[PDB]
Design a protein around this ligand. Structure first.
Ligand SMILES: O=c1ccn([C@@H]2O[C@H](COP(=O)(O)OP(=O)(O)O[C@H]3O[C@H](CO)[C@@H](O)[C@H](O)[C@H]3F)[C@@H](O)[C@H]2O)c(=O)[nH]1
Ligand SMILES: O=c1ccn([C@@H]2O[C@H](COP(=O)(O)OP(=O)(O)O)[C@@H](O)[C@H]2O)c(=O)[nH]1
Ligand SMILES: O=c1ccn([C@@H]2O[C@H](COP(=O)(O)OP(=O)(O)O)[C@@H](O)[C@H]2O)c(=O)[nH]1
Ligand SMILES: O=P(O)(O)OC[C@H]1O[C@H](O)[C@H](O)[C@@H](O)[C@@H]1O
Lengths: 638, 206, 309
């Protein structure tokens, strides 16, 4: 006798409070609707990041009677049992909108158990776990720790049905343990990619999307040195009551590579920040753009020969996966775009940013000095205009006495004195750069500059930020943050400042990167092999999609060179737009926000949880609903 | 002096344990002639003064500058970052005080109506909101320096750091700008100039 | 609108018990034709609006402006003093926040040393010193009005105050900017101009800042006034005996026209007391609107201005 309407939810992932990629963005953005629906019955679970948890997690005291209700009391007893066997953890509010209670386990606190647990996984599931891989060590530790936890809660609680949701293979070791131990929870597993799919695409050799059905998963898992990890992912997908991906593209891929057809799709949502005035986002664009203008001016000191009022800012951003994120196509297309723009005599300038983390030794002295040099000129100009002010003012108030025959000054010399001219000329000299030196293609000192993939590609296409180039390149090998000394923007702000996002991914199960642009009214280029692009392609006729700032490049049914040329066509079509047309396209882009709100997407998570309860407790679900409903998949039930 | 103070806050970001109203600024400067100019004596006497002041329980702080040219590869990234992080905190404070202003002003213009019983705000919560607090805390985080990292003794990357007469002497007397040292040491191996990005003073002004 | 607010704070110095974030600005403007421009209906309607808003317990405030030239001896001493007293408080607050700045900064840069246990200051006393308090209190004392004095209904000294049609009508309906009135009257007997020392806006700027024009004309072959108003995306009340109203009436169905910011009072087939009651219905219908509704109505009004090109 467990209640199906009043049930617990436990959501488990490695990224619960430390950003690695898009899963962090899923869990965070999704917390408001999830908390709104469950309140004190919801708990996120993951591994404790002993270094970085301080910044994001408000630590709470889980021991006081006030910290749980009486129906929720069993969760406290379960944590008190884990304490009495020496398992250390942290309870707290995650400092995000929603404020969901978290439970972060110290993986060091059970590291002694590693060998008998690795062995129990070999003998009673089949998974060879070579000691070399510290990642699969920490996945096994987490999974055994969480299946232990849910085991206690399931025994000690007798009111609520319990839903255990798990995201990625890293958090999916607990899945086979719950099935094998017959624990009284119902499980969902969501995979946001596949191991084999990454690695197949990364080695950018073959035509993955068309030639998928004919890959030998055991041969291919072998050759990539991945088999032990692939086996965890497979066991997660096979042991779950409900199995899900985020996109239909990935569902197709998880069928053939993990050997189970997913029960449905959990497409990713955003926490859509409405404004009271619809147009407020346009004003934010112009504020944030001016901060990008400030950075650019420093970067190009002594080589600043274009008008920022007639300059557009393109960016790619994401983790350093050169082929999969499409950094190769981006750089190639910019180079052809540069040639098209020179040939057609365009007056526009494009400044392309690549924001992708790479091993570095911080910012170059050059990039910092320029910012300082420009800031110093700004203050000298301020000094000079104050004086100019005293002088215009005196003239105006004195007119027409003491031989002031015109209402205003007419000669510059009445206002600008030689001491003013001397300090302005000094600051101009400090901005000067040596003969033939060009604005850099990178802002940081790299570890291994000569072997970096992005830099070598920029060198190959010869985008060296020459004055004749109408496309400029700036590689910023770190994620954006507002404490950044040269470009003090958070990533969200920087995105608002830019004009066009460009994410020509080959492998992208969803791609929050273009989705985040859409919600901020910034047009984006994506591909038809990306979850987000496939999804939007299904909602909007593909030519109309461009007018709403959703440019989709065909990387499935076209030769790579036709795709590059299509991407270039798109860029050039955008560069030709007038300002009015840019302003109107951003508005149309902004309207699409509603389609990506979690208030719409999060209904799929409800269907996935209903199906878990429908599979785990068929008899009770029947008598709660009236009929024996179809449990074959998520849509068949709803 | 206030421009010197600006540099010094940046140089000591995250290790700023002294009051600049009770700090004194000594200097040596000229061509780099270690023996002839007195640089060996200067550094020696400062180490003895530093001991003397600790013993007597003085609350003063001496920041001692050396301005003599040596072969270098420009300013350290730390010298420039510290300056920028401080500049960034300033600008953040300015945004916050502008909001504080609007709230003090509304209170002042409305008193004694709508249940305002005092002429002025009495609680800091009426003026300082959580969004204001968040961005200040971030600016403070940016200025924190690693566990056991001290304020450096040099502003530039030296060509031959290990063989430099002034740095080796500073290291020998052990003036590492520890919090308990009442005498701080900053070797600036370049002639001063108002276009300097960290300390934008001409030498005469300094 | 921020420049209007700035004027309003001065005008109501020592009597400022309402919220400008929830205040609407109505105006009428034109030649001083008390009867033909509808100034009498306007004032009579406002006094009935004031009644309806008080009864409903609304927390909104309407400040209505009359911009019609009448013989005058320029601005009053009262008008100019209040403006300067308010500026003097602005500058003093700006001194104090500069001080507060130094103190916040010092704490931030110094943490966690010399006993600073919290990242930020928590006690206002750390930031706000007694010299700062004394300054601010003095500026506040300068803003105090004598006991029982209400914000004026006019900004100028008038040549023939006792026989002025507009002021006689305002005093007849007893709109004296009392704190419990939710409608305030300000008669400004001079065309606006950015050289004006109390409300330094030209007319077009003033209109843009306002929320609703009210132009209940009786004789008006065209009505340039509501037309300009429409071109600036500001909604407006007109009449079917105005040529602008007649033209819009024929071009849009009247219940739909309210959506595009064009309210049309019937003065042709209704008794005057019915026209006044309709004018109140429209004003009250507008006050009720939320900000999002106001914003989208202005957007629709601005589209409509294509038709007048
Ligand atoms: O300077 C920066 C630049 C970017 N970011 C953020 O990084 C996030 C990247 O997620 P994105 O969905 O684009 O791809 P990713 O998670 O890397 O990869 C796939 O696999 C994922 C596996 O979870 C799947 O969820 C995803 O949808 C797949 F395409 C995105 O939310 C940005 O806001 C940042 O924080 N700072
Ligand atoms: O940053 C600096 C420091 C010093 N000086 C000047 O350089 C000279 C230093 O003199 P030097 O050491 O060569 O011989 P001194 O005259 O000191 O014995 C003085 O005239 C200073 O005005 C300068 O131009 N820039
Ligand atoms: O402060 C003001 C108020 C009104 N007007 C102008 O005065 C005209 C009003 O016209 P009036 O009432 O003189 O007669 P109408 O032309 O409306 O019959 C409008 O066009 C306004 O632009 C102005 O310039 N400044
Ligand atoms: O950055 P752009 O695409 O040129 O857009 C520039 C425009 O941005 C927003 O719409 C601002 O509100 C406008 O005032 C500005 O003209």
């Amino acid at each position: 006798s467990r209640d199906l309407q009043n049930h617990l939810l436990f959501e488990t992932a490695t990224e619960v409070a430390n950003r690695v990629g898009g899963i962090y963005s899923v869990l965070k953005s999704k917390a408001p609707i999830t908390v709104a629906q469950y309140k004190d019955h919801y708990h996120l679970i993951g591994p404790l990041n002993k270094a970085t948890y301080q910044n994001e997690v408000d630590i709470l005291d889980w021991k006081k009677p006030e910290a749980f209700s009486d129906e929720m009391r069993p969760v406290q007893h379960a944590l008190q049992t884990m304490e009495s066997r020496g398992v250390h953890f942290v309870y707290g509010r995650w400092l995000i909108e929603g404020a969901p209670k978290v439970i972060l386990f110290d993986l060091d606190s059970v590291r002694g158990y590693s060998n008998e647990w690795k062995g129990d996984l070999w003998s009673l599931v089949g998974i060879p776990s070579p000691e070399n891989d510290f990642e699969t060590n920490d996945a096994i530790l987490l999974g055994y720790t969480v299946a232990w936890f849910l085991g206690e809660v399931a025994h000690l609680d007798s009111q609520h049905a319990i839903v255990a949701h798990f995201h990625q293979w890293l958090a999916g070791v607990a899945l086979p343990l719950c099935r094998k131990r017959r624990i009284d929870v119902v499980t969902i597993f969501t995979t946001h990619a596949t191991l084999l799919g990454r690695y197949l695409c990364a080695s950018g050799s073959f035509d993955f999307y068309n030639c998928l059905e004919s890959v030998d998963v055991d041969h291919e898992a072998g050759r990539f040195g991945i088999y032990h990890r692939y086996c965890i992912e497979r066991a997660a997908a096979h042991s779950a009551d409900v199995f899900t991906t985020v996109s239909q593209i990935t569902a197709f891929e998880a069928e053939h590579l993990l050997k189970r057809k997913p029960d449905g799709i959990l497409p990713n949502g955003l926490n859509v920040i409405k404004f009271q005035a619809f147009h407020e986002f346009q004003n934010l664009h112009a504020l944030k753009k001016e901060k990008i203008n400030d950075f650019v001016r420093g970067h190009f000191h002594g080589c600043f020969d274009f008008d920022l009022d007639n300059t557009l800012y393109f960016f790619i951003a994401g983790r350093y996966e050169y082929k999969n994120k499409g950094a190769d196509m981006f750089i190639e297309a910019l180079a052809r775009l540069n040639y098209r723009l020179k040939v057609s005599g365009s007056k526009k300038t494009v400044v392309a940013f690549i924001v992708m983390p790479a091993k570095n030794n911080s910012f170059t002295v050059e990039a910092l000095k320029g910012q300082a040099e420009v800031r110093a000129l700004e203050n000298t100009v301020h000094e000079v205009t104050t004086s100019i002010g005293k002088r215009i003012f005196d003239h105006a108030i004195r007119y027409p006495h003491n031989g002031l025959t015109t209402e205003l000054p007419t000669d510059l010399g009445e206002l600008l004195k030689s001491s003013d001219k001397v300090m302005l000329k000094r600051r101009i000299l400090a901005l000067r750069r040596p003969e033939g030196q060009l604005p850099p293609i990178v802002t940081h000192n790299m570890v291994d500059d000569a072997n970096d993939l992005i830099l070598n590609k920029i060198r190959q296409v010869q985008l060296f930020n020459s004055p004749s180039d109408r496309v400029k390149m700036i590689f910023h090998p770190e994620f954006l943050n507002a404490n950044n000394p040269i470009l003090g923007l958070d990533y969200d702000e920087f995105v608002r400042g830019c004009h066009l996002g460009v994410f020509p991914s080959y492998y992208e199960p969803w791609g929050y990167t273009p989705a985040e642009c859409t919600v901020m009214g910034v047009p984006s280029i994506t591909t038809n092999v990306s979850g987000f692009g496939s999804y939007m392609e299904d909602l909007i006729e593909t030519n109309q999609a461009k007018d709403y700032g959703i440019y989709i490049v065909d990387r499935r049914f076209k030769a790579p060179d036709e795709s590059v040329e299509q991407l270039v066509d798109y860029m050039e079509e955008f560069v030709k737009k007038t300002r009015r047309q840019r302003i109107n396209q951003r508005n149309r882009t902004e309207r699409l926000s509603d389609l990506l709100d979690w208030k719409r997407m999060g209904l799929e998570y409800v269907k996935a949880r209903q199906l878990a309860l429908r599979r785990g407790y068929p008899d009770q679900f029947r008598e709660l609903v009236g009929e024996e409903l179809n449990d074959s998949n998520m849509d068949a039930l709803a």
